[PDB]
Curated annotation (Swiss-Prot):
It comes from the Bacteria. It is found in: Cytoplasm. This is Putative cyclic ADP-D-ribose synthase ThsB1. The lineage of its organism: Bacteria, Bacillati, Bacillota, Bacilli, Bacillales. Has an N-terminal TIR domain and an C-terminal antiparallel beta-sheet. One of its GO terms (biological process) is defense response to virus. The keyword Cytoplasm applies.
């Protein structure tokens, strides 16, 4: 499978992102996409010809505008989506850090009462607000009453791993498959 990696730029600079990305692309010789209305177009193109989105979670990832977009756009496109904490191993400065917030806790959705549309929300610091960088969209899929008119945080939907705790060295390819 072709994997879209989503991340804070600072985690690229600190050689945290490359630990996971190099495992997939070099060690396992697979292929990745990633970015480090125009910028959305670029990201959309990156997400095209991928089937899995992998959010690499560092200290500030939860707060990044285009990480949020990459996640929301990934849902609309029907990508598999997972998160992986990347703070538990040493960065290029030789430091280990505590886990950052789960980006999925800061994003959410609600199905419309007729079940035909999906409304999108993000946490803006003191409240939930309608998400502005991606429009609500039509779901062509069945939407049972038990799913309608209820708010869900994305952390109730997508799975999060830790590279060290969950042994990504042995298990990453299973997480995206």
């Amino acid at each position: 499978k072709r994997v879209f990696f989503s991340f804070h730029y600072q985690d690229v600079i600190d050689f945290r992102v490359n630990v996971v990305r190099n495992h997939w692309v070099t060690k396992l010789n697979q292929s990745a996409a990633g970015v480090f209305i125009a910028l959305k177009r670029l990201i959309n193109g990156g997400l095209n010809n991928t089937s899995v989105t992998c959010v690499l979670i560092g200290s500030q990832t939860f707060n990044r505008r285009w990480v949020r977009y990459e996640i929301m756009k990934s849902i609309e496109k029907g990508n598999k989506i997972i998160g992986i904490h990347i703070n538990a191993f040493k960065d290029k400065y030789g430091n280990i850090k505590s886990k950052g917030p789960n980006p999925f806790d800061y994003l959410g959705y609600q199905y419309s009462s007729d079940g035909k549309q999906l409304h999108l929300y993000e946490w803006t610091g003191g409240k939930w607000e309608e998400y502005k960088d991606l429009a609500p969209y039509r779901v062509n899929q069945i939407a049972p009453e038990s799913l309608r008119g209820k708010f869900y945080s994305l952390s109730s939907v997508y799975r999060v791993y830790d590279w060290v705790a969950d042994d990504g060295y042995n298990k990453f390819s299973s997480w995206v498959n």
